[PDB]
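Predict the holo structure. Ligand: 6IO.
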Amino acid sequence: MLAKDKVALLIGNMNYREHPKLKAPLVDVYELTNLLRQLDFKVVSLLDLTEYEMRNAVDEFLLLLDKGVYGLLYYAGHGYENFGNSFMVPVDAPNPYRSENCLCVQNILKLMQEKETGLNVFLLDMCRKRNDYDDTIPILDALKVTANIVFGYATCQGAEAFLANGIFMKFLKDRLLEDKKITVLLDEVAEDMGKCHLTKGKQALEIRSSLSEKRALTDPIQYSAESLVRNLQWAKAHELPESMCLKFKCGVQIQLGFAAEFSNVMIIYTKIVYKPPEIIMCDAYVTDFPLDLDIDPKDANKGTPEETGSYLVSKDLPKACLYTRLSSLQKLKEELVFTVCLSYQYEDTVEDKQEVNVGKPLIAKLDM
Amino acid sequence: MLAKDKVALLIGNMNYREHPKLKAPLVDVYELTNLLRQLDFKVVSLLDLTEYEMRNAVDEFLLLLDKGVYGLLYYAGHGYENFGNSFMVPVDAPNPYRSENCLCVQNILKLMQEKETGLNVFLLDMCRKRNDYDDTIPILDALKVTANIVFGYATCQGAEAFEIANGIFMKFLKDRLLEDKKITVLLDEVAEDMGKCHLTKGKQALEIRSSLSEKRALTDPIQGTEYSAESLVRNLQWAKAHELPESMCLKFKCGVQIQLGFAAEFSNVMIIYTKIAYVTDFPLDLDIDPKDANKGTPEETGSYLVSKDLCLYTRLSSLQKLKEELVFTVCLSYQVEDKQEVNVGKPLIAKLDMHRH
Ligand SMILES: FC(F)(F)c1nccc(N[C@H]2CC[C@@H](Nc3ccnc(C(F)(F)F)n3)CC2)n1
């Protein structure tokens, strides 16, 4: 079979303000992004989205899916299942949450079908228990027999989905690259989960499929004018700032470098590249970040990138630096302008600062 | 993989009292029964059941299940799907009907999991639209994670499972059911067959819902004899399920000799045939309309069976309502009128006394 394009939206919610925090979405969204990139998928990987951001990511994602396009949606975070319907809980959801606060996966499904997609895959890596607080039970004028929808739930209905992978991604990542029909592939991952001593009687993956064709994530991509609008927009979506050298008044030169962690998460690192022998104590640190980004000023300027909450370990980046993680690039509405500070001793410590403008990095370039 | 046993309950509802009548269940239940028998399944195939009869049949099927047993439910008839749950509408359901009139499939599955079954297959050949008269919101008891459940729906959710001869689902299922493939994989190839065929592509699509985590197939061999006070009950109940009356010869005072024969069509359906003479005075619970009895051909009784497979033929299709022994009269008119009463016990599913539940 042929695919017009292969596009994926991966959402990983961990830092909830009113609900317990999660760990697995960080490793699983990162690892799934890499495997999907290997399968020639254009992937958008988003961490910690509010209801507003989640709705805008799903809506803009639909305004990319076209006739014959293979679309994949992966969600990892707090979730619930009420009367057949699945809901994904945003990080800003109140306590308790109701369906108006969350996104119904069945609503996403029907809107994808109105784009005539060639394959719709939904991987829901979440708990499927009932939400006692949901007064409404939505009845959709459900279905359109497109015979191309595959759902892979991490667990069964009324059960739980338990720097390490979650149970679903642990088994899924070992086979995702195989050249088999996605239903056959998901069924083999279920057999793998079954063989695991840990899952027996607790977690089992459930597959709901109406796929009537041999369609796989390994299908080659077949070009249209409308495809070039999403191809150009996707090229602009992951541009990273170039590493810049900053020369200070005292002779100290600093390298300021950038790494992509997710489509909305960036690592900023500072390194002292030249130090005049006359200077003994020398520290460089970043401050004055846009308030939109809501960066914790203490989870900045860490000796290792793990301390910032990053997936990337010390040996994954240029080494012997100071790391700062900006995990909310979707909230940036202006240009990324901040201050680089230099403190140095030769009795009084000496300070000097330089302002740096690095434009709108990664998903911020997509003016939303 | 190995199975303790392979047990199937097939229900085909067509003669609805207050709803449109159906046609396909007769041919589809008959042919699915024969396929599952080739795979060594103990099959109980029943047609036209009331709410009371379907609950009784489900309790009789559940007594045939034990730990590691492959259980299969196939239903063809009127059905509906509300709030994630599938309901099977019995032939005596009123118009309109509610959940308390029907049998919920998930309730049956929950009972099968209490039996520690090794495989649970549900092949639901019915429409999946909402019943707008059922205001009932499921409780519901969150099912155990047994990782051995396979649903095979004839259509997608909110769509109709219209019929055209076999029904669409059984037509595609018949070509594949005998293969040594994992049931989820086998069902998935059937879905591809329906999508490949020109006159079904776009109009009807199979839906497969599955949590099976082991390579279990309807072709798996059955393990050796289990020696317990539970296997002795289960087998001595199955040995009485399909007993057919022995062919008898009746001699009359005028010298005439008539052969009385019997044939099984379903677990609750038996044809009676007389060769040189008409049969009458059947038990009232059987509801045998004399206008349908004593036909020159079995096709005139409404039987699946034709002249070639087997005189005067009488179709007894409600054997599950037989609460006492089957006593009837063989009348003989000649040129004047003589009669002889015949007792043939409780044939087929009648010997199981399902009314016990
Ligand atoms: F969530 C949020 F950050 F708040 C947010 N706010 C506003 C929009 C928005 N859009 C999301 C992320 C960007 C995506 N843009 C493209 C473009 C081309 N091809 C692809 C694909 F990779 F999917 F094929 N994606 C579309 C979905 N997200």
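The CA atoms of residues 44 and 225 of chain A lie 21 Å apart. Chain A touches chain B at residues 83-84, 129-130, 137, 139, 141-143, 145, 147, 155-159, 181, 183-184, 187, 190-191, 193-194, 201-214 (CB under 8 Å).
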